[PDB]
C-alpha cells in the first residue's frame, strides 16, 4: 500500500523539500496548493494538471522546430527472422522517457519510487484495486489519478503526421507502395549512450590506458571507440526531445560508418628513380600492416589449424588484391608515362602501371612504350614471395609447409591471370 | 480543392561547388592545369576592439586585459606570388518539369496548378526569367567577395550537348552591373537556350568559368563552415574554410544563391537592387524579412489566390511565384 | 530475384552533397536502400518505355570524404553545416544539424529486359546513362559530365548468354575498370553465426553490431585480435511495428492513393570487399523485398558468397 | 534615435603576405631571382634568467636547476653568408567606397551614416589621411624588427594596373624619419594615388619592395606563429616561424598594422610617436590603452555622438573615425 503509508511520507518528504518553496504569505498559499497534493490529494491534482500528455520511447517532434509527429513505443517483440538487429526488445534496464509537453516534473517525480521494489508501476494502465485502496480517499480522487495515469501512455492507434516527417515509399515485390515515415528512437540512442559512456571513460578507459601502459591488467572488456561524430538537437536552446539536461545538451553521438577509402593514402610508386626507377620494392604501408599481421601468426600451432586453415593463403590473396588496388590507384595519377630520368626498373615495372601512349613511338611502338609482356611480373611476385617470409629448410614436414609454396604458386597463377592483358 | 498540406518542389538551376585555381593573365586560355589554391594556416594575435558595455568600462581593467590578448589560428587562401588571376569553375544543370511538384497530396490543387503553370507558359515564355537568371551568370555575382576590387573580372560560359562546346559566349562581368538588367546580342541566344531547356523537356548542361583578376598574392574568400564550440580556449576560433580536392571551394548553396538574385518587385524600393527570391523574402545582409504576412506580396497568399481563388496577381509580381518554384522549397504549414 | 540477362556499369557516377548520416546510429556511407530506390526510380522513368527491369545494385565506393571537423583534439568529430534562411521574426533560424558528404560510386545493376533482344546495345546503354544524370540519389545532385566523361561511355555487358570461359573473361573484363574502389556486400550469415557463435555470455541481438565498431581484445594475462575485414554496422531494412493505415485514416501522407506505415530502423553489418575476392559479380546485388505479414520491409544481398 | 546591434565594414586597405628573401646590395636591381630565406632550426640550451619570489629559492634549487637541463629547439632564419640585405615584397590594393558598410540592420541608421561620410568627403578629401598612410610606406615601418640597426633601408613602389609599370617611387626610408610627418613632391603623388583609390576614382594595385641591408649572415625577424610549448619528451619546439612555399614571410595583418599607424591625436601625448588606429586605441608593447572610454576621445563615443547625437568630433580628430572605418571591423552590440 505504498501510496498512503509511503505516499503520505512521500508528500511529507516533499513537505521538507517544500519549506524551501515557502515564504510567509505567498508561501503559505504555495503550501496550501502543494499540500492539496502532498498532504492528502496527490492523485486528483496530478490527474487534473497532467491528465492529457503523451510519453514515448521514440518520437519525431525534434526533427523540426514547430512540427508534428507520432507517439508509439510499442511492439516489444519481433518473432520473425533472425538476420537483423533493431528495437525488438531491450531485455534489461527497461527505460521510457519521452518529452511530449509534460512541464510539471515534481508531479511525475513523487510517483516513480512506488514501483522501484514494488508493483506500483503495474497500476499505470488499469487494475487499480490497491491503487484505490492506497489513496485514503473516495473513488473521485483515485479516479482522477487513474485518469492522469491512463492518459500518460494514451494510444489511439491512429497517429497524425506533419509534412516534414520524412515519408518514404518502399517498393513491394512487383506491387504497390506502402509509404514509410521513420522516426528517432530516443531511449534506444540513450541505451547506446549507456554502453558507450560505460566503455569510453570512467572504468574501461582508465583501466585500459594504465593497464596497457605498464602492467595493471587482469584482461577484461576494454576497447577504444574511434570516429564518432556529434549530432545536436537544439544546441544552446535544447527543448525538443526528452533526456535532455545540461550534460546532454544535444549530446547524441554517432558510431562510425566510413567506406574503405575514408582517409587519404600517399603514393609510393611515382615515375621517378626512388619511386619507379628502383622497382624491386613493392612498397606500401598497408602492405607493411598486412606483413605484420602475417608475421604475428607465422607459426601454425596444434590447436588453431581449423581457424588457421583458410586465413593465411586467403590473406595473401587479399594482399595481392591490395597490390592490385595500388596498381589501380597508380593507374590514374600518371599523365606523363614514358621514358625519363628514373625509368630503368620502371621500363619493365611500367607493365601494370601502363603510362600514356608515347607520341615518339614509331609503327613498332609495342616494344618499349607498348610492352605487353607481363611475364616478369610473375618474377616480381616470386621475389615478393621469397622476401615475404624466410622459408626454412625444415619447416615443411607437415602438409602446410610446402603448401606455402602451393599457395605462392596459386598467387602467382592469379597474378598471371590478372596481368595476362596488362599492357593491352 | 484546398491547400495540399504536404507540398514541395525540386531544385532547378542547381549548380555545383566551384573549385578555385590561380594563374597569370594572358595565360588564361590554357586553364586546364592551373594549381589548386589550397587553404593554408596562419595565426593571429587579437586585441580588444569589441564594443564593450556602457557602464562596465573600468579604465584600469581595460589596460589589465589588453596585455593578455586572445589567440586565434585562423585560415587563409592566398594566391601564389606568381599568380595574378583566379579561376572559378562549376557545372550547372536544369532538371525540367518546372511546375510539377515532387510532393503533393491534393489531386485537385495539383489539377488547378497544372493549367496554372500551363497557361503561364503558353501565355508568355520564360524570357523575363531567362534574362534574369542569365544576368547572374553573365556578370560574376557567383564569386561574391572576389568581385569587389577586381580590376578585370569576366565569365566564359560554354554550353555542351556532346562532350564538347555547342555554343560558347564570353563576357565582361563588370560592364553589366550587379544592379541593372539589360538585354544584349550575345545574351538573348543564351536566354532562348536556358528558357527552352528550363521548361519541361529534359536537361541542359552549362560549364561556367570566371576569371577574376584579384591582384598578385592577394587573398580570396572561400566560404567557411559553421562549427559548434571546440573544447579549448587557445584553439577556439579556427575559421575553417571549405575544400573539395585539397582546393578552396565555394559552397553549392551560396553559388546557387547568387543565381537566385532575381526580383526587383519587392514593394519597398528599387534601391537595394534584386534580392534572393525567397518565401517571405529575407536577406542576411539586411537583417529583416521583407514582404511581411501583413502585406499581400508574400508567397503563400499569391500562390493560393492564383490557384485556389483563381484571382491572378499582376504579371509584374507573378514571376516571383515561378522563380521560387524554380528555387523550390518545402511548403504547407 | 534472378541473375541478370546483362549487366550495366556506370564508371564514375560522381555525386555531390549527399546525405551522410542516413540513420540515427551511423554517419558514413549512406544507406543501400537509397540506391535501391534510385534504381526503382530509374526503372520507373526508363523501363516502362524501354522494357527492362532492375532489381539489384552494386556499390564500389571509390573515394569518400565528409564535411567533418575535429573539435580541439578530442576523441570525437563534428559536422559542417549550411546556413538556413531567415526566420519570419528575422533574428536567426532554428538551426538543425545533418551530415552532408561528397562521395564517388559506380552502380552495376540487373536487367530482365530486351536491351539486345529487340533494341540495340549501346543505344540503350547510352540513353540510360544520359538520362540517369538528371535525378538525385541520396539527397544530393549528381556532379554532371566533365573531364570524367572521357571514360564514361560503357558497354552493356551480358552475363546470362555466352561461353563459360568468356563468361569468366566478360565479368573480369568488367573487373578491369573497377580497381581502386572497395565494394559493399552484406554479411547476413556472418551476422547469424557470429551472434550465435558468440552466445557464450548473453543472447542479446542488438548487441552484435553494438560491439564490433571497436578494438575487441582479451590481452595478455600486446596482441591485437584477428580483424576479419572492416566490421561496420549498416542500416539493413525497415521494421514496421504499427499496423497498416489508409490515406484518409492518417492524413498528411505524400500521395493520397497509397497506404502509410510508421517504421523504425534495423542494423546489420556490411563488410567492404575488393572486387577481386568475389564468386561472381551477379552475387553481390542489393535486392529489395517487403514482408507485410511481418513488419520487415528489408533489403538484402542474396548469395553474397 | 537607436543604433545598430549588428554592423560591419570591409577593410579598405588590404595588403598581401610579404615573403622575404636575401641578397647582396647594389645588385639589388636584378632581384627577381633571389633565393628565399629558408626557415631552419637549431637547438638552444636554456638557463635561469627569471624572477623568483623566494618560496623555494633554497641553497640547492638554483644550483640544481642550472644543472637540470631545459634544452630546446627554436626556429631561426639567417641570411646566406654572402648576403647583407633583406628583400621584403608585398602587394597592396585599395578597394574604395570607404564608408558604405557591409551588413547593417537598420535602413535608417545606414543612410545618415553614409551621408555623414559623404559630408566628410566633400567637406575635406582623404588627402591628409592618405598622406598619413603614405608615411607608413615611405618610412618602411612594416619592417618591424628588421629595420632597427639596419644601415640603409630603401623602398621601391611601382604601380600595376596591367602587366606594366605606371610610375615608380624610390624612398630612402631613413633620411625621412619615423617621427615627423613631412610632405614631399614625389610623396604627395603617392598620397594622390591612395587618395584616389580610397575615394572611388580608379582602382589601385601597388607592390612594395623593401631592401633593408643588415649585414653579412645576420639574423632577420619574420613572423611567429602561436607557440606550442607542449608536453615534451624533454625538449620541444618553443618558437616557430611563418613559412610559405619554401619561404619565410610576415603575416598580412602585421604589415597592415604597421601601415595604419596614423593617430597622434590621442590625449595623453602627441609627439612621443604615432600609434595604430583601433577602438580604445591601444598598444601591445606599451601595454596600455590610449583614449580610454573614461575619456571622450575614443571611437565608440565619437561615432555614436557624431552619427546619432549630431555633434562634430572637432575636425582635428574626425580623421580618426574615418581611418577606423577604413580599418573595418565588427561594430554594434
Swiss-Prot record, chain A:
Keywords: Antiviral defense. Interacts directly with Csy2; part of the Csy ribonucleoprotein complex with a probable stoichiometry of Csy1(1),Csy2(1),Csy3(6),Cas6/Csy4(1)-crRNA(1). A Csy3(6),Cas6/Csy4(1)-crRNA(1) subcomplex is also formed. GO terms for biological process: defense response to virus. This is CRISPR-associated protein Csy1. In this bacteria, Y.pestis-subtype CRISPRs do not confer resistance to phage DMS3 or MP22, but instead are required for DMS3 infection-dependent inhibition of biofilm formation and possibly motility. Belongs to the CRISPR-associated Csy1 family. CDD domains: Csy1_I-F. It holds the Pfam family Cas_Csy1. Disruption phenotype: Mutants lose phage DMS3 infection-dependent inhibition of biofilm formation while there is normal biofilm formation in the absence of phage infection. Decreased production of crRNA in the presence or absence of phage. Disruption of the entire Y.pestis-subtype CRISPR region disrupts crRNA production but does not alter phage resistance (possibly OLNs PA14_33350 to PA14_33310, and the flanking CRISPR loci), indicating this CRISPR is not involved in phage resistance. InterPro entries: CRISPR-assoc_prot_Csy1 (IPR013397). CRISPR (clustered regularly interspaced short palindromic repeat) is an adaptive immune system that provides protection against mobile genetic elements (viruses, transposable elements and conjugative plasmids). CRISPR clusters contain sequences complementary to antecedent mobile elements and target invading nucleic acids. CRISPR clusters are transcribed and processed into CRISPR RNA (crRNA). Cas3 and Cascade participate in CRISPR interference, the third stage of CRISPR immunity (Potential). Involved in crRNA production or stability. Residues 66-87 are annotated as: Disordered.
UniProtKB/Swiss-Prot annotation, chains B, D:
GO terms for biological process: defense response to virus. Disruption phenotype: Mutants lose phage DMS3 infection-dependent inhibition of biofilm formation while there is normal biofilm formation in the absence of phage infection. Decreased production of crRNA in the presence or absence of phage. Disruption of the entire Y.pestis-subtype CRISPR region disrupts crRNA production but does not alter phage resistance (possibly OLNs PA14_33350 to PA14_33310, and the flanking CRISPR loci), indicating this CRISPR is not involved in phage resistance. Keywords: Antiviral defense. Disulfide bonds: none annotated. In this bacteria, Y.pestis-subtype CRISPRs do not confer resistance to phage DMS3 or MP22, but instead are required for DMS3 infection-dependent inhibition of biofilm formation and possibly motility. CRISPR (clustered regularly interspaced short palindromic repeat) is an adaptive immune system that provides protection against mobile genetic elements (viruses, transposable elements and conjugative plasmids). CRISPR clusters contain sequences complementary to antecedent mobile elements and target invading nucleic acids. CRISPR clusters are transcribed and processed into CRISPR RNA (crRNA). Cas3 and Cascade participate in CRISPR interference, the third stage of CRISPR immunity (Potential). Involved in crRNA production or stability. This is CRISPR-associated protein Csy3. The gene is csy3.
From Swiss-Prot, chain C:
Disruption phenotype: Mutants lose phage DMS3 infection-dependent inhibition of biofilm formation while there is normal biofilm formation in the absence of phage infection. Loss of production of crRNA in the presence or absence of phage. Disruption of the entire Y.pestis-subtype CRISPR region disrupts crRNA production but does not alter phage resistance (possibly OLNs PA14_33350 to PA14_33310, and the flanking CRISPR loci), indicating this CRISPR is not involved in phage resistance. It comes from the Bacteria. CDD domains: Csy2_I-F. Pfam families: Cas_Csy2. Keywords: Antiviral defense. In this bacteria, Y.pestis-subtype CRISPRs do not confer resistance to phage DMS3 or MP22, but instead are required for DMS3 infection-dependent inhibition of biofilm formation and possibly motility. Belongs to the CRISPR-associated Csy2 family. This is CRISPR-associated protein Csy2. It comes from Pseudomonas aeruginosa (strain UCBPP-PA14). The lineage of its organism: Bacteria, Pseudomonadati, Pseudomonadota, Gammaproteobacteria, Pseudomonadales. The gene is csy2.
